[PDB]
Design a protein around this ligand. Structure first.
Ligand SMILES: OC[C@H]1O[C@@H](O)[C@H](O)[C@@H](O)[C@H]1O
Ligand SMILES: C[N+](C)(C)CCOP(=O)(O)O
Ligand SMILES: [Cl-]
Length: 137
């Protein structure tokens, strides 16, 4: 089926400290050419509520560009009817302190349709990814 999703950690190195600017932790690309109503990311496990979890026991908040956070529902969502693959990124807010360790994210992605118009889930995939933060000496 034409539904597809790519959840990948960012290739570039991340450095421990107060992040100098917005830094992408993960890249998320999902799409379908044939009809649907929208898309959502439901964080799972210890990612509950939009969080990366460190091997030091720290949660760090993830933010989105394309989608919008609904905490009442614990999901990022975006409503769009179009074939164009959605280019979205999970990132950390500037000034966010990162520690030189391994940050994990688990979730599941869902696709839907509106009739009428309340969410019916057409597809799901379980995304996950990790990013290991380097150090500045
Ligand atoms: O486009 C409808 C959306 O409404 C939001 O409130 C909800 O959190 C999403 O899961 C989705 O149902
Ligand atoms: C934005 N969030 C509520 C999903 C995560 C929390 O972010 P922050 O409290 O780490 O800034
Ligand atoms: Cl957000």
């Amino acid at each position: 089926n034409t539904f597809h999703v790519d959840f990948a950690p960012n290739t570039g190195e991340i450095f421990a400290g107060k992040q100098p600017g917005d830094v992408t932790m993960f890249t998320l690309t999902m799409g379908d050419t044939a009809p649907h109503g929208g898309w959502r990311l439901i964080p799972t496990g210890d990612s509950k509520g939009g969080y990366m979890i460190s091997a030091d026991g720290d949660y760090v908040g993830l933010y989105s560009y394309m989608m919008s956070w609904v905490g009442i529902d614990n999901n990022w969502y975006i409503n769009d009817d179009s074939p164009k693959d959605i280019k979205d990124h999970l990132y950390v807010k500037a000034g966010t302190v990162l520690k030189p360790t391994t940050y994990k994210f688990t979730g599941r992605v869902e696709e839907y349709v509106f009739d009428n118009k309340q969410s019916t889930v057409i597809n799901s995939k379980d995304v996950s990814g990790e990013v290991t933060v380097k150090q500045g000496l």
